[PDB]
Amino acid sequence: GLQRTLVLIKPDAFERSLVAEIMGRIEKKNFKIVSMKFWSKAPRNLIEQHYKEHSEQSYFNDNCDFMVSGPIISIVYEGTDAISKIRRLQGNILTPGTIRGDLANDIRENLIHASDSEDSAVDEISIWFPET
Amino acid sequence: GLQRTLVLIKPDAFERSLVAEIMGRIEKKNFKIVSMKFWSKAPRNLIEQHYKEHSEQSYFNDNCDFMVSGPIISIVYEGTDAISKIRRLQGNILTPGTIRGDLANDIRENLIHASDSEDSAVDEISIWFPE
Amino acid sequence: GLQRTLVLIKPDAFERSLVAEIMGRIEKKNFKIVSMKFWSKAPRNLIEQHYKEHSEQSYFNDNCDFMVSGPIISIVYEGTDAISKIRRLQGNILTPGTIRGDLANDIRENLIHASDSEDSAVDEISIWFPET
Amino acid sequence: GLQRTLVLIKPDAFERSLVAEIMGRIEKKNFKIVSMKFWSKAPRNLIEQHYKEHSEQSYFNDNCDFMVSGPIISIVYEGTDAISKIRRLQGNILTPGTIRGDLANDIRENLIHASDSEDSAVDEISIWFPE
Amino acid sequence: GLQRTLVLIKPDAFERSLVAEIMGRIEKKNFKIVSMKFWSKAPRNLIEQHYKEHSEQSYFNDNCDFMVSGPIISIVYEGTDAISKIRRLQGNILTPGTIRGDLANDIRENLIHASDSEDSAVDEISIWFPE
Amino acid sequence: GLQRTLVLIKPDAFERSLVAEIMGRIEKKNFKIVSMKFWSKAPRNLIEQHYKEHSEQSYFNDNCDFMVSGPIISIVYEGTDAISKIRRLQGNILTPGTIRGDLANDIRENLIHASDSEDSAVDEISIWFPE
Ligand SMILES: Nc1nc2c(ncn2[C@H]2C[C@H](O)[C@@H](COP(=O)(O)OP(=O)(O)O)O2)c(=O)[nH]1
């Protein structure tokens, strides 16, 4: 039933004034905020931990540089089937109706991260909320 | 082209203050209200009749309990291809862009019913609007 | 504390697809629907009763004709200080922020009626909801 | 891949006061206006050229009639993958989440046109914005 | 009393993706577009004429600079009491419920201009729409 | 011009799912989040300190009870004239167009606190963000 998932609101959301728009979409599907931190600039080690599965890719450093270019919010959301449901809400830039489908048009500047699995959720929550 | 369909706004929509949000999505798709009733509490007999096709399912009684747990609005909507279009608007909890997709996250508490066929529409309209 | 007020959603709201927009504004201020009726065309006697205080004015018949030109919803709303608060939400065509201020621009086609006093509320509710 | 595409806001959008709603959906996806013309009533020749590929279909003249029945806005939008993305945003009357999916319910009165290919985009831009 | 008024959507509205939001507030009040021009960068002369009455103020040239720092839309709107009503809709940065009250927070970068009188409306329309 | 102010999102905003709606209104007015904390339950001592100027009022204890009845968000916002502008956005339950005017209808459960002066802002920021 109940799950917790990790969401990042990305620097481009701040730049484009879409923070509340994104949070509102998750809130409207009835998911609750369990933990939340605002980072004026997230420490790079946290970002590199978060994206460690990508450490070998050509885009790794550039993506980290983006994620450090402005503020981030890290949020733990709770609700039924939260991991998959918030992943679906995130969507992609090809799918209207979703956060990325309605609001994003870039492979990197895509507004929001949501955990993609039970395993990744557990790990991302411990990165951003280790006092847990 | 022109059809009529039956919509129920469920008790969870009242509890969560989403009645206008739901009705607004249908209105914006250019469907028109032909008939509408507000029930502070719907008669259990009407609920059991509405969900008669589910009477042998494990969830039948609990669902009926939920459907009488608060107010409901029954609406007849009219427009081109209304039955399937409003069904598509209803959607499901997995599909963002739809009413249930954007707003609901429960197998039972899912905000809206819309008729799924011509036969069920005629039957459901008859139930809520016997006049 | 708690009051009930009578709201009419006018034919122009139907014509312009603003029914839910208007109802949403009242719902968002936390007022609850206690009674509601949809009228494909309201009987004229009800409209003339509703506007009886205006029976002598030059605009009486024309206003009644408008109120009968399309569907109406009659709603009883309940909440703290409902009469005055919903009156304020209705507002007027000069006051942005209000239903009429944001959405209406006519002396007659102004989308919504809300009871203006305790006395008028009691009387309007009994017109539209006599089985009460 | 930066692209430019042609959008028409149709007379039904003006009639239904949905012009800003439509433009806003495109604006929110980060597409930029490159040029724009308002036509209180579009010259018929421009409409016939626009739908030239449809001249042998039974609906051609009634569709043209509709397209001159009220104002039109023609817009050149620019952005990454604009042709395909704005086409997707336009969507269809069956798919909620899109402009047509949320707002339209007719085969003819469907609110918006967006170029469907690189070739048609070049051609449609030359019709509405020959300069 | 049917009137026509001149509206400018300013470069900050384009920068902040608020063009449709602004136009939508006017559209929802039932005002109609009579003409519209998009300016990727407005000719400076047009801007200097528009703010001619301010030519002796200290902010004149910096204000002009801002007004050519990005695109502009000039619109002629029509409706009952349009000059006063659209002026009121524009509002000020202190008053929530209005365009500037909800969306702007600067003396210069304030999103929208609306004609403030019958005389200025006639004059502003002649600048932007001389034809 | 530039100021910082302290905002609390109150427990009733969480209960009614209005957190983003409230934050969205401030964001749209171009104010920026400088600091933010989520409290699943705020320490009563912090609440009593925040409302210290009310300690001799009849409603003090009940208000504190309410303020610890659910989660709160404390936010420092920054922008031009932030203290009074965000105060104006907060508004009151009588004034439509504002946060409390559109969304609240209670003397206690009123969704948002915003600092009302420079002195109270410095003091309130110090309370919630002692760092
Ligand atoms: N191919 C490619 N991929 C990129 C580039 N920059 C960033 N990315 C990837 C890194 C991330 O996995 C993804 C966006 O961030 P995210 O939080 O992982 O979302 P998602 O990809 O799981 O849906 O985009 C890039 O420049 N090229």
Ligand SMILES: Nc1nc2c(ncn2[C@H]2C[C@H](O)[C@@H](COP(=O)(O)OP(=O)(O)O)O2)c(=O)[nH]1
């Ligand atoms: N599958 C399922 N449905 C439940 C449960 N509890 C209540 N329901 C209700 C909610 C659905 O709106 C209603 C009918 O759903 P179907 O999925 O039965 O819909 P339909 O056959 O009317 O088109 O059953 C439940 O526990 N499981």
Ligand SMILES: Nc1nc2c(ncn2[C@H]2C[C@H](O)[C@@H](COP(=O)(O)OP(=O)(O)O)O2)c(=O)[nH]1
């Ligand atoms: N002066 C004038 N007043 C008119 C005209 N047509 C309608 N009215 C009045 C009748 C109503 O009192 C008012 C609008 O309806 P309502 O439900 O009474 O709202 P309100 O006037 O109490 O705010 O407009 C009209 O043509 N001229």
Ligand SMILES: Nc1nc2c(ncn2[C@H]2C[C@H](O)[C@@H](COP(=O)(O)OP(=O)(O)O)O2)c(=O)[nH]1
């Ligand atoms: N298929 C079809 N199209 C019609 C009819 N009447 C008007 N039209 C217009 C609406 C369409 O936008 C226009 C072009 O046809 P299309 O390429 O199938 O649609 P589309 O690419 O705009 O989605 O034809 C009609 O009766 N049938």
Ligand SMILES: Nc1nc2c(ncn2[C@H]2C[C@H](O)[C@@H](COP(=O)(O)OP(=O)(O)O)O2)c(=O)[nH]1
């Ligand atoms: N008063 C003032 N106005 C400035 C300044 N810099 C740019 N402006 C511009 C913004 C105003 O829209 C424009 C015209 O002045 P106005 O008539 O007082 O404002 P308004 O009628 O557009 O609300 O002057 C400035 O520094 N002070």
Ligand SMILES: Nc1nc2c(ncn2[C@H]2C[C@H](O)[C@@H](COP(=O)(O)OP(=O)(O)O)O2)c(=O)[nH]1
């Ligand atoms: N006046 C009043 N205020 C109450 C009551 N119960 C709780 N409160 C709280 C809600 C207000 O946000 C808080 C402070 O309001 P003021 O009106 O005291 O605001 P301020 O002095 O912080 O600017 O007092 C109550 O019963 N009456």
Ligand SMILES: [Mg+2]
């Ligand atoms: Mg990923």
Ligand SMILES: [Mg+2]
């Ligand atoms: Mg179902």
Ligand SMILES: [Mg+2]
């Ligand atoms: Mg009256």
Ligand SMILES: [Mg+2]
């Ligand atoms: Mg086509």
Ligand SMILES: [Mg+2]
């Ligand atoms: Mg001026």
Ligand SMILES: [Mg+2]
């Ligand atoms: Mg207060």
